[PDB]
């Protein structure tokens, strides 16, 4: 499982107990688990259980959730995207972020 | 993520932000990501983020999307397939 | 396939023939198969078929199942979790 600061879950629209994909930019590993809420404002991203074989402290990851919907909705759907930098500082747009 | 010439998305019925499977004919790797639109006519197929660990420039890949529907409709369903060769030239 | 003591299936809400994810804490491998019922009280967890390549006797694993439902219901959904230790002794 992956414990995630509740503020981050809210920004990405991800629910506690929702299925998530984690794609490890650092090492290339890809794995699917579920979300666990960590305390709001903790800025925690914690890989728990077997998932700890797939990421290490300091790894840069992308955490995604997927939903299903009919085609017409899909065609106008806008994902909830949160961008990070630094000490897991959240931003609304990619335009803020260093190299 | 995988950015894909919008012409190609149009031919395959794949939508921006849709889940996609990528099967690497060159190296055998298989992974799942989502589609991003690239400029129409560019012939781009760009692997971004962690997916850059799964494919290299020049690798040949198959990019697929899946949908659900009831069994009665599934029996006659017809997928949207686009064929390519050379430098991402569509229609053969 | 993975055969699992029916007591354990009952506690976790996992059904015979349901899709299951298996995450191997010992060796890191992750795979998806389906659940088979083993005799009630046997405490069995048996990896069968090709899955025998992904886990060895004595490996510690997490076995999960997933369901879909609309967002409104998902917000209050509560999973069925069973905790184990020692020789597959449930309730701690």
């Amino acid at each position: 499982x992956c414990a995630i600061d509740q503020d981050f879950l809210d920004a990405a629209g991800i629910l506690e107990n929702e299925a998530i994909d984690i794609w490890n930019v650092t090492n290339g590993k890809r794995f699917s688990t579920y979300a666990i809420a960590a305390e709001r404002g903790s800025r925690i991203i914690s890989v728990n259980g077997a998932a700890a074989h797939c990421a290490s402290v300091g790894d840069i990851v992308i955490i995604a959730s997927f939903v299903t919907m009919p085609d017409e909705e899909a065609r106008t759907w806008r994902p909830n995207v949160a961008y990070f930098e630094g000490d897991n500082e959240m931003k609304r747009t990619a335009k803020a972020i260093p190299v | 993520x995988c950015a894909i010439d919008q012409d190609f998305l149009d031919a395959a019925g794949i939508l921006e932000n849709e889940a996609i499977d990528i099967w690497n004919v060159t190296n055998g790797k298989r992974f799942s990501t989502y589609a991003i639109a690239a400029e129409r006519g560019s012939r781009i197929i760009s692997v971004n983020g962690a997916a850059a660990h799964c494919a290299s420039v020049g690798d040949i890949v198959i990019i697929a999307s899946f949908v659900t529907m009831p069994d009665e409709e599934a029996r006659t369903w017809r997928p949207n397939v686009a064929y390519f060769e050379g430098d991402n030239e569509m229609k053969r | 396939x993975c055969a699992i003591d029916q007591d354990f299936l009952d506690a976790a809400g996992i059904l015979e023939n349901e899709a299951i994810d298996i995450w191997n804490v010992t060796n890191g491998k992750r795979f998806s198969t389906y659940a088979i019922a083993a005799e009630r009280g046997s405490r069995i967890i048996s990896v069968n078929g090709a899955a025998a390549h992904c886990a060895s006797v004595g490996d510690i694993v997490i076995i999960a199942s997933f369901v879909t439902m609309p967002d409104e219901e998902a917000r209050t959904w509560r999973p069925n979790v069973a905790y184990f230790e020692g020789d597959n002794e449930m309730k701690r």
Partner: peptide
């Protein structure tokens, strides 16, 4: 009814850093 259903990116955390790893987690 019988509508075709797509799987779509709902949302993501882009380039978040892992802060902790716990192989032995009880939860």
């Amino acid at each position: 009814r019988g509508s075709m259903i797509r799987t779509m990116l709902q949302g993501k955390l882009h380039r978040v850093k892992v802060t902790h790893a716990d192989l032995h987690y009880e939860g």
